[PDB]
Short mmCIF file of C-alpha atoms and ligand atoms in Angstrom, two decimals:
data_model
loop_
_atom_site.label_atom_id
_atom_site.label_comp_id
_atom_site.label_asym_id
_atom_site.label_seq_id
_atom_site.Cartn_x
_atom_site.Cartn_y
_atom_site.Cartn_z
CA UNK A 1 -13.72 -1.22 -18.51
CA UNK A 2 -11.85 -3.49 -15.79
CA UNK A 3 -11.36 -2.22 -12.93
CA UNK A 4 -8.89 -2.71 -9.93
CA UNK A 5 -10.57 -2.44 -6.50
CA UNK A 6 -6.35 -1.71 -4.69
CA UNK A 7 -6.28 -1.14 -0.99
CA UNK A 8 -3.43 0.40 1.27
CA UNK A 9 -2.86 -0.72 4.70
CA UNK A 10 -0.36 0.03 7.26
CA UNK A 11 0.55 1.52 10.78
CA UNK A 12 -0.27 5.10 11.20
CA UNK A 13 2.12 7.96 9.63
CA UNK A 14 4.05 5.52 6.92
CA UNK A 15 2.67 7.74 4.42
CA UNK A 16 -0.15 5.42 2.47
CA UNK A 17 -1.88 9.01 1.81
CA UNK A 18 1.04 10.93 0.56
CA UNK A 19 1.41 7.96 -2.34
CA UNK A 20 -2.08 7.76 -2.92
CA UNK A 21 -2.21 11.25 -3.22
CA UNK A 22 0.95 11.78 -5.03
CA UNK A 23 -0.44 9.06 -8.11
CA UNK A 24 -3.79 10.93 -8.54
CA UNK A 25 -2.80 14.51 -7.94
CA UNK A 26 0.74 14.64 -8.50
CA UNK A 27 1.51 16.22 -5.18
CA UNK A 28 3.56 15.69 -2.26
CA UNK A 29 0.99 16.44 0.80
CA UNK A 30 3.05 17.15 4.28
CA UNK A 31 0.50 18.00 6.07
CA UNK A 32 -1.05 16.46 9.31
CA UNK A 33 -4.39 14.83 8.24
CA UNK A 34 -5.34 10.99 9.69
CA UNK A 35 -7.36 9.04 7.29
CA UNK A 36 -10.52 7.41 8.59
CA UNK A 37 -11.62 5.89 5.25
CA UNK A 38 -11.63 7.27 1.49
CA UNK A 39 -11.71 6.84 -2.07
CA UNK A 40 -10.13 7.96 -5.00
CA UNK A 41 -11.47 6.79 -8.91
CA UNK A 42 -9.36 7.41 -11.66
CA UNK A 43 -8.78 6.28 -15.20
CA UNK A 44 -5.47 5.54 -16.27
CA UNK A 45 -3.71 3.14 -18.98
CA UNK A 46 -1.70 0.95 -18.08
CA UNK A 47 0.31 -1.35 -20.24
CA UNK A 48 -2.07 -0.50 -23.08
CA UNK A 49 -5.18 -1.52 -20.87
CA UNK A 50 -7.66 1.02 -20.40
CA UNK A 51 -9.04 0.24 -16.86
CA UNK A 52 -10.37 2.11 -13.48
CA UNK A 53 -7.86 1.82 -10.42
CA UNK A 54 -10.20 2.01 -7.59
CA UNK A 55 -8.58 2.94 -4.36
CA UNK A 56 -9.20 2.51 -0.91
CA UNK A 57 -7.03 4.71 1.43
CA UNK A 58 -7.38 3.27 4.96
CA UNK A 59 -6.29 4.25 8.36
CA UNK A 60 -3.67 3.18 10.26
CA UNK A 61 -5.62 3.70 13.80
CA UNK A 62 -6.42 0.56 14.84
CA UNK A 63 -9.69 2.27 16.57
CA UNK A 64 -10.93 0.79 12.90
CA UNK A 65 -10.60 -3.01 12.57
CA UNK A 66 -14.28 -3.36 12.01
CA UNK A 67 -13.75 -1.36 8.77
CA UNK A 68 -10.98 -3.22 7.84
CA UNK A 69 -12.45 -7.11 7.64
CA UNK A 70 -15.23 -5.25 5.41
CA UNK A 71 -12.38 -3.02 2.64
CA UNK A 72 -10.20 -6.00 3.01
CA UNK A 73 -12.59 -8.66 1.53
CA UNK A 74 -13.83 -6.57 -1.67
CA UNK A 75 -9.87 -5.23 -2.24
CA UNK A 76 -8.31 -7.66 -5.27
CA UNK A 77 -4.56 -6.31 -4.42
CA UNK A 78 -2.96 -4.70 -1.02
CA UNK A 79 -0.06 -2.36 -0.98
CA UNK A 80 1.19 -2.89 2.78
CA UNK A 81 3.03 0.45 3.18
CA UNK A 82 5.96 0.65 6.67
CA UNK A 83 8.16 3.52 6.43
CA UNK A 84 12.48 2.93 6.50
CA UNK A 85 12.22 5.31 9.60
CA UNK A 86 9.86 3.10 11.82
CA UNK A 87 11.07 -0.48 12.67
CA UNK A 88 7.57 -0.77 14.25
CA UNK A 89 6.04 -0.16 11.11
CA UNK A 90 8.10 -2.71 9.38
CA UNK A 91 6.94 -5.15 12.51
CA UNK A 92 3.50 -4.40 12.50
CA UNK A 93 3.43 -5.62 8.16
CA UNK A 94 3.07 -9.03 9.62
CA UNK A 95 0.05 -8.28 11.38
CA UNK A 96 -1.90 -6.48 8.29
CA UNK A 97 -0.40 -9.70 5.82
CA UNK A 98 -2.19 -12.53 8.22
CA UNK A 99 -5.35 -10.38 8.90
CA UNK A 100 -5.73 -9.62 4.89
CA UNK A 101 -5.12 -13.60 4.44
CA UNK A 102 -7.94 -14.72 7.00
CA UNK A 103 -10.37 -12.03 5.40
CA UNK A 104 -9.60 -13.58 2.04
CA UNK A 105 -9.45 -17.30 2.99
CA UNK A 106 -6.28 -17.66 1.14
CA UNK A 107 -2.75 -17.77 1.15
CA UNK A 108 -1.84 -16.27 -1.65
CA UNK A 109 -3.08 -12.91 -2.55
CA UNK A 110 -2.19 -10.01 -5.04
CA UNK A 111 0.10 -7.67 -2.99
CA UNK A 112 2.85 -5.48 -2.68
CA UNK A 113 5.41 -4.69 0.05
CA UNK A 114 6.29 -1.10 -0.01
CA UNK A 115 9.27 0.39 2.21
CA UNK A 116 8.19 4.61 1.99
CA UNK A 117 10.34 7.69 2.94
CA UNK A 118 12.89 6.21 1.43
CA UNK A 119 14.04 10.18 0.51
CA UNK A 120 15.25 10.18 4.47
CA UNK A 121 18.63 9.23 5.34
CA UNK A 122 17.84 8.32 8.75
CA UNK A 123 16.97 4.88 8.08
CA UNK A 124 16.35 2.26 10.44
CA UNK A 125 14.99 -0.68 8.49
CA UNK A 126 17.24 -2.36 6.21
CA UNK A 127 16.39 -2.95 2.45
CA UNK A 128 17.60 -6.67 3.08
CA UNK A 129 15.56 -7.37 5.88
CA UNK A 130 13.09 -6.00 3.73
CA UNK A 131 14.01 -8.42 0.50
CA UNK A 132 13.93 -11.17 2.77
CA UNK A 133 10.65 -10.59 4.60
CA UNK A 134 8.88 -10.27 0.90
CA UNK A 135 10.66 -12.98 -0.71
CA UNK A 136 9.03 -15.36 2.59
CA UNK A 137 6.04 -14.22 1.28
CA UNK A 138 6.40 -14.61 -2.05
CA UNK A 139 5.79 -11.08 -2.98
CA UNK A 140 7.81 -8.09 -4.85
CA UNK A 141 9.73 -5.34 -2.80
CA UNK A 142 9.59 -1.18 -3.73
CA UNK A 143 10.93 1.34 -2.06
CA UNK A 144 8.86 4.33 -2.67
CA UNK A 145 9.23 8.28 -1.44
CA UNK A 146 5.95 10.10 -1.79
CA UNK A 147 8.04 13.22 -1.80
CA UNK A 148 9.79 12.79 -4.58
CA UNK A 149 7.64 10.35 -6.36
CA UNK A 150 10.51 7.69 -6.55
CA UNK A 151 8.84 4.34 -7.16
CA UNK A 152 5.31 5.28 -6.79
CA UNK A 153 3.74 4.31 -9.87
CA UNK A 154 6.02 1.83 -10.09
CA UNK A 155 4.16 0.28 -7.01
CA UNK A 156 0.84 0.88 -7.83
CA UNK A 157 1.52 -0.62 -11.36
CA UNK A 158 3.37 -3.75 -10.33
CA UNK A 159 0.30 -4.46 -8.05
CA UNK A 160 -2.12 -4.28 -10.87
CA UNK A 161 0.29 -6.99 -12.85
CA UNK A 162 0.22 -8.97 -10.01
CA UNK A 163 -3.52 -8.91 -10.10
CA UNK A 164 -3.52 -9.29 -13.89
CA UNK A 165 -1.04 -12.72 -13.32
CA UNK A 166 -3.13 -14.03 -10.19
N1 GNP B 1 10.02 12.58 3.98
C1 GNP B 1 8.87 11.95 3.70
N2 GNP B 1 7.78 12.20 4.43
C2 GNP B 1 6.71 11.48 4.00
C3 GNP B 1 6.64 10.58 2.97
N3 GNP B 1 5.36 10.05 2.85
C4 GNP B 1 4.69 10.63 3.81
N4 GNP B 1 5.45 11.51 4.55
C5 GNP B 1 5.00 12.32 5.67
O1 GNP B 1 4.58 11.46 6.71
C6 GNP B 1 3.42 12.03 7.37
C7 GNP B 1 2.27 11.06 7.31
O2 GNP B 1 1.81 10.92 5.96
P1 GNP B 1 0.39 10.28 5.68
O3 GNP B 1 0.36 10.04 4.22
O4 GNP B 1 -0.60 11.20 6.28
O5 GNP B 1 0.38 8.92 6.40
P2 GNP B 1 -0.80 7.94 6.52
O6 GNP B 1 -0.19 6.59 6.51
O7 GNP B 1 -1.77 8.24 5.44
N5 GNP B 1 -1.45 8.22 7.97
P3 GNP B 1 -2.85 7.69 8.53
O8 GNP B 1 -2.71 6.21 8.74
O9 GNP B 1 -3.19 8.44 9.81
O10 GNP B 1 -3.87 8.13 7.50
C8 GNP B 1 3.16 13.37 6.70
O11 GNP B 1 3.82 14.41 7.41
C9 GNP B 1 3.78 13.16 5.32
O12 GNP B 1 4.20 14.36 4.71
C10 GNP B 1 7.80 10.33 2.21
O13 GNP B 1 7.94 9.56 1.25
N6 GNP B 1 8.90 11.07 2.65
MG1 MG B 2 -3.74 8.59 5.59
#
């Protein structure tokens, strides 16, 4: 069946765990456990499609970039994950977007902005700034919470279309 190699990426603590986890085993994990590198396989349909989403959680320590050129050349889609309570999360996206791009040799590539813990009301990143920072890079906007699973497979979905369209 076709399968979609997706990888998340972003700063430490945004929460690219909690919506991996949350879209395979329909949980909200708040617990305190960095990622170094792992994988999660599962069959789902989507749109009608039988196909494998193959996921690569990474970390967000930076102790790892020598991981990262090697996940973020065999990944066909990115979800770059920031959380609405970290304006240094939000910062950092632009970082993860030119890296992914120079691992990929091109400009355009299959990817999703994600704004998480949007379930907090102590927000410091504005969805605008948000909506404008995507629409620079030509690429959709979701606000997700892994907590109460608002927008998650909505994210993860979208990304495969954009995959499907690229
Ligand atoms: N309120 C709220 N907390 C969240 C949400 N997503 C994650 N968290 C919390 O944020 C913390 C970090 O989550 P985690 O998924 O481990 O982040 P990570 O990006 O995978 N970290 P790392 O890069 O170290 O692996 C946890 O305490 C988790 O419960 C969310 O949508 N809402
Ligand atoms: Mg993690």
């Amino acid at each position: 069946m076709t399968e979609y190699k997706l990888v998340v990426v972003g700063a430490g603590g945004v929460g690219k765990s909690a919506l991996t986890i949350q879209l395979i085993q329909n949980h909200f994990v708040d617990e305190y456990d960095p990622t170094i590198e792992d994988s999660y396989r599962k069959q789902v349909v989507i749109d009608g499609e039988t196909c494998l989403l193959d996921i690569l959680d990474t970390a967000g320590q930076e102790e790892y970039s020598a991981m990262r050129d090697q996940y973020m050349r065999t990944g066909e889609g990115f979800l770059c994950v920031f959380a609405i309570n970290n304006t240094k999360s939000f910062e950092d996206i632009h970082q993860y977007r030119e890296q992914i791009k120079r691992v990929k040799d091109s400009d355009d590539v299959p990817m999703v902005l994600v704004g998480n813990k949007c379930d907090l009301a102590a927000r410091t990143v504005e969805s605008r700034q948000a909506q404008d920072l995507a629409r620079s890079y030509g690429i959709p906007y979701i606000e997700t919470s892994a907590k109460t699973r608002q927008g998650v497979e909505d994210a993860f979905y979208t990304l495969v279309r954009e995959i499907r369209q690229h």
